[PDB]
């Protein structure tokens, strides 16, 4: 048995894929084009983004007005999909044993970009509030909303933030610090991320082509995804996590994938499974030249050649940055629950260097699978791989 396994009791995943479970599954099983064009994020240019194209709650509770932001509204919109059943569930645990670990790379920064522009253009006598854009605001707002009294804190490690939050909640449970942990992440679209990544030349000119022969960068997306973890059994369990640091470059991955391969192997080890037992890998698969070349090298090192179905879903959700790992974990859970489909890889000509793998070209799953893996490889060489099982 896997000594670190924790059950996913509840989950929610809001993203460009949709806001109802049936919609999201169909979007991943079909060549639906789910990204949206935006002309208001980068000057003199339209970008394809993974936009949540549904309304957010028009209000935050009264006692939380000070921290209101689109990011928090997104978070509370997702949480309210499970809140009723969650409150029924948590009744049997002590309030101090209900913990929260969440990831974000944006918090509410989008809401201050307007005021900061006005500050820089003239009105030098306005008072902008900082707490709604602080990273810690997320976990503390969620804690206040739920009335929980266990530890609550925020992980902010760029693209690996929310995946590391899942791994943190697993640890909190098996360190006897909590009996229930809300984990996941929420990021929202903003000018800072779109223009920051544009300055690194990391953005595609159109829609991203993960592992494609002529891939040219990423599309950014927003997502709000949460999981309720406990030590008890559940239809899908989080079984293993592997975390490493490249210690190579501040914004380019180790070119041999040494950090990524080790993260994947450590996840398998913690789950007590071999690479052969994995039925699907959800790649990080951002569609930059550097990431996909590095990642498929690491996959080949750990899994071999033509051995495991895999796909990137970042052409559907976009690269959701701090929330990438959580929304991708949500996809992995649904795959394991349904035993029916796998998420389509982008229909593109694969780079010849990367073609020796079984990219998901058609959604039908023909044999049941027991274990799935999801990768997140971030800035500062922060790597994590998660293993889920039934």
């Amino acid at each position: 048995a896997a000594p670190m396994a924790v059950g996913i009791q509840f989950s929610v995943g809001l993203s460009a894929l949709g806001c109802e479970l049936n919609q999201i599954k169909q979007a991943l099983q079909q060549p639906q084009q789910t990204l949206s064009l935006r002309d208001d994020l980068i000057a003199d240019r339209d970008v394809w983004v993974g936009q949540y194209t549904h309304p957010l709650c028009s209000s935050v509770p009264d006692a939380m007005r000070s921290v209101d932001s689109r990011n928090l509204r997104f978070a509370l919109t997702a949480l309210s999909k499970i809140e009723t059943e969650l409150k029924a569930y948590t009744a049997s645990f002590e309030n101090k044993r209900l913990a929260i670990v969440v990831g974000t790379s944006t918090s509410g920064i989008a809401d201050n970009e307007l005021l900061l522009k006005q500050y820089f253009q003239g009105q030098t006598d306005l008072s902008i509030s900082h707490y709604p854009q602080e990273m810690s605001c997320l976990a503390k707002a969620l804690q206040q909303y739920l009335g929980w009294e266990g530890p609550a804190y925020t992980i902010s490690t760029a693209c690996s933030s929310s995946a590391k939050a899942l791994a943190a909640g697993q640890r909190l449970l098996h360190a006897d610090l909590a009996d229930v942990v809300l984990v996941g992440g929420v990021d929202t679209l903003c000018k800072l991320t779109l223009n920051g990544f544009n300055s690194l030349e990391s953005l595609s000119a159109h829609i991203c082509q993960p592992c494609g022969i002529s891939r040219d960068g990423i599309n950014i997306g927003e997502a709000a995804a949460f999981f309720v973890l406990s030590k008890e059994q559940a239809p899908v369990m989080l079984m293993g996590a592997g975390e490493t640091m490249d210690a190579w470059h501040i914004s380019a991955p180790h070119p041999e994938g040494k950090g990524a391969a080790l993260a994947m192997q450590r996840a398998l080890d913690m789950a007590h499974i071999s690479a052969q037992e994995v039925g699907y890998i959800n790649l990080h698969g951002t569609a930059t030249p550097q990431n996909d070349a590095m990642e498929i090298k690491a996959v080949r090192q750990v899994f071999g050649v033509y051995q495991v179905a895999l796909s990137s879903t970042k052409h559907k959700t976009g690269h959701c940055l701090g929330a990438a790992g959580a929304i991708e974990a949500f996809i992995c859970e649904q795959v394991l629950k349904d035993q029916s489909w796998l998420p389509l890889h982008q229909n593109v000509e694969i780079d010849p260097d990367l073609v020796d793998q079984n990219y998901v070209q058609e959604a039908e799953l023909t044999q049941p699978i027991r274990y799935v893996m999801s990768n997140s490889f971030a800035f500062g060489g922060s790597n994590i791989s998660l293993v889920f099982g039934v």
Partner: protein, 203 residues
């Protein structure tokens, strides 16, 4: 939550940093002031030893650097890519790992000193191969453009945490508060003070 805490070091701004001698001066000079503080304190607390995991903790990160990037962005200019890449919340953890050639796994949190210690405990208690955790907190005051901005001396504080023969117990973790690193240092270094209202006790 009970921990053995050792090698507590609290650093403030200095004209030069002894611990940073191991980093070649060209790269050392390109560290932001806050990056110098954090890396100096991390090396100092480690004291030549190693750790199995590093927990970096910062409420604000480098808000001054993010402000300059945002000015360019909100002026429809393309920001500096090196500034952006070193403005992310985990940039210091990544700089430490590269410049000190230490690939120890790490995380970067936005929270108080107590929650950093909780994350360390969870790592030690749940992971058999993690036996020593380094916890490094750092912050500098917010740009005065923000309404809540208050001046304080920029700081980094680090310690090495292990499980056996604990000398520290954490009895409360919902206030969390002003339960910052400077308040902890005051409590930890007062030989007559055995308990703290922030929920810490010596044992």
């Amino acid at each position: 939550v009970t921990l053995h805490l050792a090698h507590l070091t609290l650093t403030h701004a200095q004209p030069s940093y002894a611990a940073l001698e191991c980093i070649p001066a060209m790269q050392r000079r390109r560290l932001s002031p806050l990056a110098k503080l954090a890396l100096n304190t991390a090396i100092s607390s480690l004291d030549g030893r190693s750790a199995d995991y590093i927990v970096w903790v910062s409420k604000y990160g480098d808000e001054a650097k993010t402000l300059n990037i945002l000015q360019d962005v909100l002026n429809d200019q393309t920001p500096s890519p090196t500034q952006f890449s070193t403005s992310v919340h985990n940039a210091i953890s990544g700089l430490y790992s590269i410049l000190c050639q230490d690939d120890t796994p790490s995380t970067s949190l936005s929270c108080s000193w107590t929650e950093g210690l909780i994350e360390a405990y969870a790592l030690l208690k749940s992971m058999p191969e993690i036996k020593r955790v380094l916890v490094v907190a750092y912050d500098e005051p917010l740009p005065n453009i923000y309404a809540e901005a208050i001046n304080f001396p920029a700081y980094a504080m680090a310690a090495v945490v292990t499980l056996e023969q604990p000398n520290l117990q954490i009895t409360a973790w919902t206030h969390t508060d002003e339960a910052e690193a400077p308040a902890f240092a005051h409590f930890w270094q007062d030989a007559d003070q055995l308990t703290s209202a922030f929920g810490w006790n010596k044992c």
